[PDB]
Amino acid sequence: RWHGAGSTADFQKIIQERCDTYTQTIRPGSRSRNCQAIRQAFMSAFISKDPCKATKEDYNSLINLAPPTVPCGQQVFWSKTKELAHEYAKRRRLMTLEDTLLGYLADGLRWCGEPGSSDLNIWSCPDWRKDCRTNYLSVFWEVLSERFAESACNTVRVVLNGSLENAFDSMSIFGRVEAPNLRPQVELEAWLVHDTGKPPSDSCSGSSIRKLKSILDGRNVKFRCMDNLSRDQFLQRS
Ligand SMILES: Nc1ncnc2c1ncn2[C@@H]1O[C@H](COP(=O)(O)OP(=O)(O)OC[C@H]2OC[C@@H](F)[C@@H]2O)[C@@H](O)[C@H]1O
Known part of the structure; x- marks a missing residue:
């Protein structure tokens, strides 16, 4: 349906693997974070929702688990x-933003869902210019950046x-x-x-x-x- 490339294949394995790598081998020491729960929240933010109706509020919980x-x-x-x-x-x-937990997870990835499906759309995702700005990919980066700058x-x-x-x-x-x-x-x-x-x-x-x-x-x-x-x-x- 969309003009943008589809979601990164095996997106949820990737974000969980990167989460383990980051919290254990890249930036450990602080408080522990559960990477399973971080992946679950990340997925729940956008999965099975209208891909062009993303709001900053869809990501508050995810960000709260690991502020940038x-x-x-x-x-x-x-x-x-x-x-x-x-x-x-x-x-x-x-x-940089890419060196925070969530930025590290998301760096270079694409994702979107589809209403009534529990899975990522791996065939196409909304393009920011040709489809809608209010897509889960662009909105994640805007809200993460905002929180990044505020802190x-x-x-x-x-x-x-x-x-x-x-x-x-x-x-x-x-x-x-x-x-x-x-x-x-x-x-x-x-x-x-x-x-x-x-x-x-x-x-x-x-x-x-x-x-x-x-x-x-x-x-x-x-x-x-x-x-x-x-x-x-x-x-x-x-
Ligand atoms: N880690 C990332 N991985 C993939 N895409 C990203 C990432 N970070 C941002 N983007 C996206 O790629 C686009 C990059 O557009 P530019 O014109 O080169 O630069 P700026 O817009 O100023 O973003 C960079 C600053 O803001 C946040 C901080 F990371 C930076 O200080 C952007 O729209 C995002 O959708």
């Missing part, structure tokens, strides 16, 4: 720079793309959901990083970054911006 909250001073946001941001985070022992604390960093005309996209999840919900009085450092072998098309002085400074002022978040750095200069030396 990162230790003070270790949190990293990104926008149009996913792989660079993850390399940077890994090197510096920081955490941020002390210094947080963001990696943005200085090779685009607008390194800050106000219609992005970083622009629309994360920056505007960022816990007040944290401090944000932005790095605008450009493709090796190309001059940067955006800077800290550009229009888009001015919009971001405006948002951060309203949250009483201090802002430091660095730019004109190649991926190599940025990584080799932030």
